[PDB]
Design a protein around this ligand. Structure first.
Ligand SMILES: [Zn+2]
Length: 255
């Protein structure tokens, strides 16, 4: 979890890879990122996306998709091959001034959306996480301002999954409603940002944030880390701090 006695600063004791060479998130220093003209544009094909369910797993809430066929896929950019969307989730703060996992020149956003995809050549998500190129996660920053209409269906169902382990049917949700206008991105190799912290992720972090209203993000902060009938602990600040870049270069698709 993310408390004072089991937060990210303790994870290394159970998951020694927490101190590894390609851990995420990181600070993106925009002046030392390298423009790489050989990076292709991202290809996001989400028209046939089939959402199934939304679940409070005690760390965040996940919206899960049917990933048994190539329905919603990410290609191009720095990627070789086809990556299927399996779930998305957010990280957010107790205050608007924090919540994102990645930072841009040390600037924190109010929240960060992760669309998680796995490389179809490995057959399933479980095998993919064991490979250095197993996952691609698209990261999108949220700043507080105008409401995001395409997010509201998610906000409205949160009441039904308040506590850990609760799930609700969540069909016909279109993830295209959560993308910014521009798909310019930074990319670097990294890890999952929750345990088991495996170093299997190609990160693709979009330069343009989306805006959500204060009321929308306030509703995220009413969820609970705990299960029903346990003492209430609000689900806030479920973000891991920036880790050292070590021997990695962040590349940019844009100048
Ligand atoms: Zn995440």
């Amino acid at each position: 979890g993310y408390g004072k006695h089991n937060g990210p600063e303790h994870w290394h004791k159970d998951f020694p890879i927490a101190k590894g060479e390609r851990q995420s998130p990181v600070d993106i220093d925009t002046h030392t990122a390298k423009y790489d003209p050989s990076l292709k544009p991202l290809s996001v094909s989400y028209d046939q996306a089939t959402s199934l369910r939304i679940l409070n797993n005690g760390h965040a809430f996940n919206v899960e998709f049917d990933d048994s066929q190539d329905k919603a896929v990410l290609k191009g950019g720095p990627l070789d091959g086809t990556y299927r969307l399996i779930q998305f989730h957010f990280h957010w703060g107790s205050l608007d001034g924090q919540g994102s996992e990645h930072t841009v020149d040390k600037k924190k956003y109010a929240a960060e959306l992760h669309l998680v995809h796995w490389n179809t050549k490995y057959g399933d998500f479980g095998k993919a996480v064991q490979q250095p190129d197993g996952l691609a996660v698209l990261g999108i920053f949220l700043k507080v301002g105008s409401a995001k209409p395409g997010l509201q269906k998610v906000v409205d169902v949160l009441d039904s999954i308040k506590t850990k382990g609760k799930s609700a049917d969540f069909t016909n949700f279109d993830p295209r409603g959560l993308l910014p206008e521009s798909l310019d991105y930074w990319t670097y190799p990294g890890s999952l940002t929750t345990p088991p912290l495996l170093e299997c992720v190609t990160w693709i972090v979009l330069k343009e944030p989306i805006s959500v209203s204060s009321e929308q993000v306030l509703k995220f902060r009413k969820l609970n880390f705990n299960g029903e009938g346990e003492p209430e602990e609000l689900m806030v600040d479920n973000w891991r701090p920036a880790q050292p870049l070590k021997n990695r270069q962040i590349k940019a698709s844009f100048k």
